[PDB]
Amino acid sequence: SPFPLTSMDKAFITVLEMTPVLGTEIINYRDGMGRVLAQDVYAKDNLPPFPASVKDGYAVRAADGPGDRFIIGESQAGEQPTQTVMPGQVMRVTTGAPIPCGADAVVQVEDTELIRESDDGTEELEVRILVQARPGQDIRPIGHDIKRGECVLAKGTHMGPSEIGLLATVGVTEVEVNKFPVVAVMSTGNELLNPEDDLLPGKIRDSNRSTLLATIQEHGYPTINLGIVGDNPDDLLNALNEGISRADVIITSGGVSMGEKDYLKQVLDIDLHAQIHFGRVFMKPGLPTTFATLDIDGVRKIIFALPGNPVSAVVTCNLFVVPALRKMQGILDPRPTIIKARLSCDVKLDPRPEYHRCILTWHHQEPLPWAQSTGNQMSSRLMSMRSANGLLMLPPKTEQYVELHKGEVVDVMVIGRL
Amino acid sequence: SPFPLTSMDKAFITVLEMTPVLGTEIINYRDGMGRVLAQDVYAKDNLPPFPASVKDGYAVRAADGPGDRFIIGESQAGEQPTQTVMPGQVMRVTTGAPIPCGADAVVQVEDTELIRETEELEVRILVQARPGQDIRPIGHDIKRGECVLAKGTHMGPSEIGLLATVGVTEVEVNKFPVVAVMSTGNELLNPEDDLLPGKIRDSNRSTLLATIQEHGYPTINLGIVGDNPDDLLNALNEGISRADVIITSGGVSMGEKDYLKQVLDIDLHAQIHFGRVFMKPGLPTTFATLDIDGVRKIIFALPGNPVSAVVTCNLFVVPALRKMQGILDPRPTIIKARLSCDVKLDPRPEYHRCILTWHHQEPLPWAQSTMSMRSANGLLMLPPKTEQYVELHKGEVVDVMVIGRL
């Protein structure tokens, strides 16, 4: 008080360590997008349950070899074949059709010739196999993909579209997954107006609340809009009390930061009895960033107090909030993805570790993507035909490196799905 | 008939060209995620509307330089200041607070010292200030009348906030494509059902829906449809009336049982652009368009093979859907990566579901063909085998198509 300048490295690990992992719940598989399995998933069937043809052709005997064969019928999809392949006989099969007994190989239609058909010309009767087949050729044996009783999905798996389809395959329509964090977002400041309102003297429109919510919703977490809150202990405590009762995470933006006008941290410590882990982070932007946890009824809520500056709000949210949210929803490695890219613009370095919204662009035969830094607020909006999907990670300036130039390999954090 | 083997290159550009761009509609700015602006957006205000302090400190006169100063008052946020900074005087300001007349520079509190005082009275400025220091002049961020968002912009969280900044809460954007998904095949059961002889569970419909839903497009579940012209026609007719895009999976591609292509041609009189694509997997992939009432619906017939379905859906459907919702470049992002495993090459251009992982201090990511804890976010793009290149080895630079969150 004033809080010590916490290093960027320590501030990040503090958030993750103090961030809890939510409990679990049972959901339907169709709602499993982005969910993390808290259970092993076992298959109760074989895939395929029956020998299935890979190609459109004929179920044949390899020992019969090439030559003229009788077509005893066709194996239909969804039906266990009733006829048995005798020597000299074949059965027409399509891709996915069950293989009849007696057959041990499938010759595709491209390696065949239709010899003779019925007098009506409506039925195939005799076919010539032009090739020699190996036993098991173009056949998916029982359980080739999935064996019965086999673990197809382990606990801790972060599920996508394919993992949902896999659940549908094995027939497990109900799974145990971690809950999603409910995120409440509010804005503080006596100068803030709703975006729907016209400007008044000394007033600006609240943009952080819209951006923050949009950022969380992009990750698919449920959000709560607590609206604009006056910068005073009474209104802050009411908003925080509402957010705590309704959400697992409470994000606020604005506030008069440090000093004796620091209502935010006064309410947190004195009224709320919350533990403030840090109030200042040696970074740019987002120096006045506050992170706190609160334990109620054995449940830990986390509270982010982000800077009022619009650029700082989105940057700090991607750096601290999102990794914390990913941890709460059960992701084993909640850390952000950091890739290598080349600078599209020269940039002066700051004594503090600096982060810039940027646009990542991959080219045709170029191995590394080009990261064009967005100056901050408006610069990109002349070339913003694409949304900023990256976060340029600039090192703190030293006597060695005071300025970075065009083409150098730098760290960029992917902050949005491409 | 059987449809000519369309090259993978031609099949892709055909889908995009034949795929239309949807009309526009008015939405609230809070619903603008992933939307494309069909209009320019101009600012009607200055940002900031007033000169604002960057630091928490005191508004000073640069001409006065360092020395002892009188605190005439404090500039509150949301209030227009009434006092004027005279020589030898300063005013306490917070970050974002309006700058009073008379002051041309801001000295942060770290460069000051309380001399004499619920109210402060005197302070010493310890440094010399440059005119305009730590001050955001009127319109420094956004000037009035300036175009802040051009039409064609694919909006994200920041664009939503920019809309909220300028006060444009209603914007004109392209519609999102409504996509109907159905599965065909007499062997298909619902995932809730136990297996019957010769039957498997329908997984394609779940995967395809989840794929489309991930991009935020509204979807319609047409369920399982029998492999016969009557049921197919009913399902297609329903999908056509209710959706812009109809996706089907399964069904006999080749033979004469091609009920799907029979219905499309005979009953619906739709134009089939290709029925086969020289690719692995997804050879029996069909793309058709249908013009009803001056409106073009698009139809995808994906292979029944589960792996083929998800691959063809990311290669053809998603780029088509992005074009419909107004995205200027609907082409997927392709990156260079290293192979995590050796792989035999196929005469056909091959595609594998893979997982992109960036290792520390390593410029290129590694792609691992289907760790198991993570969902596949990439689609490995293997080249067709030619000459000396019969096989690709571990460490070689290959193309990977981003299909998920990195």
Binding site: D9, K340, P353, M393 | -
Partner: peptide, 8 residues
């Protein structure tokens, strides 16, 4: 893994 930024 670093949250700050490396060089080359």
């Amino acid at each position: 893994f670093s949250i700050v930024g490396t060089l080359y």
